[PDB]
Amino acid sequence: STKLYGDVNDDGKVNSTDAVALKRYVLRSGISINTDNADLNEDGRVNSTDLGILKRYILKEIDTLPYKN
């Protein structure tokens, strides 16, 4: 796979699983994911912002990536 903005599971594609997966990390549950891919805005850290962006991306809310926050 490749560094895809949204691919947290590191599978090479943005699937619904990537959304729920990111939600687990943001909650600080202790889930290992690809923070590099999670960062959709390139803020430097995976925060609630990235989560919303990832979800919105799959919800046909945003097509232009990466985001500039």
Q: Which residues bind Ca ion (CB under 5 A)?
A: 7, 9, 11, 15, 18, 39, 41, 43, 50
What is the smallest separation between the CB atom of 19 and Ca ion, expressed in angstroms?
9
Cα separation, 26 vs 19, in Å, equals: 11
Q: Is 11 annotated as a binding residue?
A: yes
Return d(Cα 65, Cα 11) in angstroms, integer. Answer: 19
25: phi then psi, degrees, rounded to nearest 5: -65, -45
Q: Is 3 annotated as a binding residue?
A: no
Based on CB atoms, which residue is closest to Ca ion, 29 or 51? 51
For residue 50, say whether it is annotated as part of any ligand binding site.
yes
How far apart CA 35 and CA 47 sit, in angstroms, is 10
Residues of each annotated binding site for Ca(2+)? 7, 9, 11-13, 18, 39-41, 43, 45, 50
